[PDB]
Amino acid sequence: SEANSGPGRVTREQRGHLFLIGLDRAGKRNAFDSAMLADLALAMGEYERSEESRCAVLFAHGEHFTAGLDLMELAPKLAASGFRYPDGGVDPWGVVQPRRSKPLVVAVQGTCWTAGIELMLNADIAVAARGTRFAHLEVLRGIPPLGGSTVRFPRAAGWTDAMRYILTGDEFDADEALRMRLLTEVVEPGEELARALEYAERIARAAPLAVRAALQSAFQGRD
Amino acid sequence: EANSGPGRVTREQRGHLFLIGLDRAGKRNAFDSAMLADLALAMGEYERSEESRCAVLFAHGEHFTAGLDLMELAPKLSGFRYPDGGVDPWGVVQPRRSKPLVVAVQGTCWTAGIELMLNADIAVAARGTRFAHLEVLRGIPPLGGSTVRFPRAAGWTDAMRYILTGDEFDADEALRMRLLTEVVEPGEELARALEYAERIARAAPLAVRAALQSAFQGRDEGDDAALSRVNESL
Amino acid sequence: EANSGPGRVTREQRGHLFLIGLDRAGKRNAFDSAMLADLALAMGEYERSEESRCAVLFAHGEHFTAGLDLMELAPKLAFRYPDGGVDPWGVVQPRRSKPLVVAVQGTCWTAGIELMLNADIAVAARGTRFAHLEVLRGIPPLGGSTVRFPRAAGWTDAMRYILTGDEFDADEALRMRLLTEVVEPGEELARALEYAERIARAAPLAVRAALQSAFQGR
Numbered sequence: 163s164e165a166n167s168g169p170g171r172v173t174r175e176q177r178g179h180l181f182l183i184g185l186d187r188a189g190k191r192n193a194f195d196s197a198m199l200a201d202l203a204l205a206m207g208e209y210e211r212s213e214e215s216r217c218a219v220l221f222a223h224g225e226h227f228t229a230g231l232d233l234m235e236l237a238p239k240l241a242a243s244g245f246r247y248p249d250g251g252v253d254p255w256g257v258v259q260p261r262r263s264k265p266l267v268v269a270v271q272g273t274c275w276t277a278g279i280e281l282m283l284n285a286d287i288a289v290a291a292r293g294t295r296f297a298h299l300e301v302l303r304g305i306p307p308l309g310g311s312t313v314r315f316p317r318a319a320g321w322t323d324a325m326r327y328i329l330t331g332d333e334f335d336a337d338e339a340l341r342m343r344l345l346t347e348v349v350e351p352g353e354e355l356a357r358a359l360e361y362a363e364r365i366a367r368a369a370p371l372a373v374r375a376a377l378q379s380a381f382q383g384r385d
Numbered sequence: 386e387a388n389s390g391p392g393r394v395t396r397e398q399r400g401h402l403f404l405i406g407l408d409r410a411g412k413r414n415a416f417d418s419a420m421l422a423d424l425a426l427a428m429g430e431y432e433r434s435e436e437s438r439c440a441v442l443f444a445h446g447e448h449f450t451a452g453l454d455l456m457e458l459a460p461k462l463s464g465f466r467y468p469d470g471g472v473d474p475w476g477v478v479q480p481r482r483s484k485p486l487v488v489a490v491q492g493t494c495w496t497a498g499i500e501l502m503l504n505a506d507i508a509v510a511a512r513g514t515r516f517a518h519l520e521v522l523r524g525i526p527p528l529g530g531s532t533v534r535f536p537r538a539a540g541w542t543d544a545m546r547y548i549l550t551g552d553e554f555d556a557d558e559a560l561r562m563r564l565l566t567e568v569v570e571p572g573e574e575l576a577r578a579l580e581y582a583e584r585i586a587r588a589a590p591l592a593v594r595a596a597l598q599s600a601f602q603g604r605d606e607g608d609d610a611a612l613s614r615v616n617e618s619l
Numbered sequence: 620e621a622n623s624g625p626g627r628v629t630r631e632q633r634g635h636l637f638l639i640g641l642d643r644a645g646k647r648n649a650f651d652s653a654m655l656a657d658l659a660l661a662m663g664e665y666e667r668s669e670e671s672r673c674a675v676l677f678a679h680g681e682h683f684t685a686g687l688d689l690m691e692l693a694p695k696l697a698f699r700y701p702d703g704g705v706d707p708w709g710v711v712q713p714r715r716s717k718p719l720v721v722a723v724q725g726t727c728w729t730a731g732i733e734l735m736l737n738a739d740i741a742v743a744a745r746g747t748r749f750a751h752l753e754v755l756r757g758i759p760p761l762g763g764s765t766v767r768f769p770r771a772a773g774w775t776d777a778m779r780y781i782l783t784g785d786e787f788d789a790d791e792a793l794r795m796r797l798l799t800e801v802v803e804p805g806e807e808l809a810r811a812l813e814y815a816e817r818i819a820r821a822a823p824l825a826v827r828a829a830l831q832s833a834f835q836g837r
Contacts, residue, residue: 265782286778301592316600318773320538320563325506328596329485330584343773364783368754375619375759376781382614383766384774477837521821525828533836540771540796541833545739548829549718550817607836609714611766616710619762 165189165224170198170232172205173223179366180359181208181215188224191273195232196239199308203251210252210262216366216373220285221269221355230276230299236307245308255309256284261381263374265365269358271351276300277309283318286377287361288344290336291351301331317384318343387411387446392420392454394427395445401586402579403430403437410446415454416497418461421528425471432472432482438586438593442474442505443489443575449514452496453528465528475529476504481601483594485585489578491571496520497529503538503564506585506597509578510556511571516564517553533605538563541608621645621680626654626688628661629679635819636812637664637671644680649688650730652695659704666705666717672823673815676734677722677808683747686729689758709737710762714834716827718818722811724804728752729761736767736797739830740814743789744804749797755784771796 167189175182183205185192192198209218222228236245247253252262255277268282271291279296282288300306316324319342327334336348349357365373389411397404405427407414414420431440444450467473472482475497488502491511496519502508520526536544539562547554556568569577585593623645631638639661641648648654665674678684692698700706705715708730721738723731727749735741751768753760760781768777772795780787789801802810818826 265778283774286775286782288775298596301588301596303592304589305592305595310599311596312599313602313604314774316604317769318775321503321534321600321604322506322508322538322566323563324600325485326566326581328600329506329588329593330581331588332584343776346775346779361779361783364785368782368784369757372754372757372759373782376754376765379615379618379760379762379765380769380778380781382618383611383769385614521825521829524822524825526825531829531832533833536833537770541736541767542739542741542771542799543796544833545718546799546814548833549739549821549826551821552817605837607834608766608770609834610836612710612763615762615766619759 163189170195170201172198172201174205174208176212176215179214179216180362181212181218183209183218183220185222185228188222188226190232191226191229192222192224193229193232194277195235199245199254200248200251202254203247206252206254206262207250210260210264215264216370217265217267217362219267219269219358219362221358222271226272227270227274227294228276228278228281229273230278231306231309233307240307254284255280257312263377265373265377267358267362267365269354270294271354277306280309280312280314283312283314283344287346287358289347289349289354289357289361290339290345291354292336292348293351294336294339295333296335296339297333298328298331301329315344392417392423394420394423396427396430398434398437401436401438402582403434403440405431405440405442407444407450410448412454413448413451413493414444414446415451417454417457421465422468422471424474425467428472428474428482429470432484433470437484438590439485439487439582441487441489441575441578441582442501443578444491448492449490449494450498450501451493452498452519453526455527459527462527474504475500483597485582485593485597487578487582487585489574490514491574496526499564500529500532500534503532503534507566507578507581508564509567509569509574509581510559510565511574512556512568513571514556514559515553516555516559517551518548519551521549522551533607535564537604626651626657628654628657630661630664632668632670635670635672636815637668637674639665639674639676641676641678641684644678644682646688647682647685647726648678648680649685651688651691655698655707656701656704658707659700662705662707662715663703666715671717672819672826673718673720675720675722675811675815676738677811678724681724682726683723684728684731684734685726686731686752687758687761689756707737708733708761708763716830718815718826718830720811720815720818722807723747724807732768732797733761733763736764736771739818740799740811741797742800742802742807742811742814743792743798744807745789745801746804747789747792748786749788749792750784750786751781752784754782768797
């Protein structure tokens with residue numbers, strides 16, 4: 163086996179101007195425990211301070227992007243005041259400051275429950291394997307500890323299509339997500355990482371100070 | 386059956402669903418001051434109804450709404466106040482709703498009905514329902530006037546193409562522009578709206594409420610607020 | 620006939636339509652400080668023309684615009700619009716208060732997507748070529764599109780283009796809701812007048828009202 167069924171963690175690979183971050187807990191369909199939330203935030207931080215990295219690519223090892231939060235492991239470890247990211251981290255859901263200031267591309271496949279959706283909406287370019295399944299299952303349960311829905315879904319899909327899914331928790335697939343403007347592209351299973359890298363390389367080809375200026379500008383449009 | 390007198394609204398609790406019906410078919414559900422107040426009171430009561438988890442707004446008759454009754458209404462405004470403990474159906478005046486609203490529309494949907502429809506979370510229309518922003522052809526609209534919701538849903542340009550012209554569009558064009566959730570066979574819009582509302586009512590109410598509250602952030606923020614934040618950045 | 624010198628715009632009053640033409644076809648309508656000022660001027664003129672109920676922005680020659688003329692404009696940012704000018708990319712104050720239709724053809728780089736997203740209607744000849752070259756050129760965003768592009772296209776498709784500088788055609792622009800209509804080459808100006816015409820029939824005080832309401836929001 164290579165699928166990790168232990169505590170979550172994230173792989174890190176510098177490929178030229180690209181910084182690849184892989185969710186590494188495939189034996190648990192990448193359900194996020196405190197270890198993997200800490201490690202993902204730290205890797206995002208490292209990306210931010212890496213002068214050579216011009217674009218990050220976030221992806222998942224295995225057949226599933228994420229099956230949501232590991233609430234059984236998380237619960238005991240939240241303080242009354244909430245979940246806190248490690249010093250040096252950047253919030254992978256883009257709620258808490260500091261905000262990332264460099265581009266991000268994301269590849270998703272298979273299962274993308276819950277906190278997965280917002281994680282993916284926090285990117286600049288999103289590609290999915292055909293047949294990927296998305297759902298806000300948590301609205302059926304109660305308010306989650308983190309990764310809850312924001313304005314990013316309504317902004318992209320328009321109000322009513324977003325509410326159709328946010329308030330019911332019903333499943334939608336990658337074609338529906340593309341139709342709603344949450345994804346740039348749907349490709350064949352096994353192609354998402356590669357297609358995501360093509361996008362990240364084009365961004366990396368552009369002029370770093372321009373790209374950052376462009377992002378800052380846009381971030382201020384929506385804030 | 387059909388009421389041609391002062392406007393009013395039906396109310397019904399059906400399990401966790403709160404049903405509100407426009408009841409002035411006799412005038413195509415044109416809104417007088419009476420029906421505006423009664424609709425806002427019906428929403429206020431939904432808000433305070435512990436066990437209502439979703440509201441369904443629909444219209445008795447063949448027509449959702451012909452818009453405002455300017456004859457009755459104009460000679461009564463400087464400006465429109467809602468009753469205490471009413472909630473503005475148009476969602477423009479505080480307080481804003483905080484629970485879900487699903488709306489079913491059929492036939493005719495003039496001016497104030499469009500905006501009423503875009504203030505909801507799920508909108509279902511009968512095939513062949515007709516919409517138009519007829520206000521432009523005359524003068525400024527006293528209420529249900531044009532909003533940012535239309536451009537947010539449709540995009541600036543497609544919204545301008547109907548707002549600035551007053552041109553008529555149907556249910557299929559409204560769907561294409563993302564104003565509706567779904568288009569259905571005439572006579573099926575309320576049954577369908579109900580199924581959606583039953584689905585939202587099975588969700589956890591605290592989680593639904595907190596979802597709405599996150600989404601409601603800057604929802605109606607105009608594009609000149611974004612653009613000012615940006616010009617400084619450069 | 621094609622202007623290769625300092626930029627300028629034509630103005631023609633045609634009924635209740637105020638027609639503004641970019642006139643520097645010799646340089647594919649790249650915006651030097653002269654065109655910017657003149658366009659800004661023209662736009663202020665339309666604002667004060669009680670006769671005009673809709674403006675139509677088109678370009679002379681084959682190409683809408685090849686973008687900013689950064690070599691000439693470099694020193695000009697030591698940008699101040701003329702008095703009584705209105706910012707064509709509607710970023711600075713004062714903002715326009717009347718409707719604007721735009722017709723686009725061929726090459727529409729950079730500042731030209733800018734102009735287009737700042738209108739109420741946009742018609743393009745099919746085969747029009749669009750691109751946000753700022754990132755490739757090494758220059759920052761004009762401002763407006765940074766906001767208006769994600770609004771029309773949604774975040775991911777807008778970043779896909781803005782962050783890469785990749786080119787896209789009129790059909791892709793239409794799918795992303797940057798355009799109202801795509802028409803056959805040669806039709807864009809005619810089709811655009813049809814829309815502006817339709818806008819000129821509505822009540823000008825109500826037309827003004829709707830606009831102000833949509834800009835501000837709530």
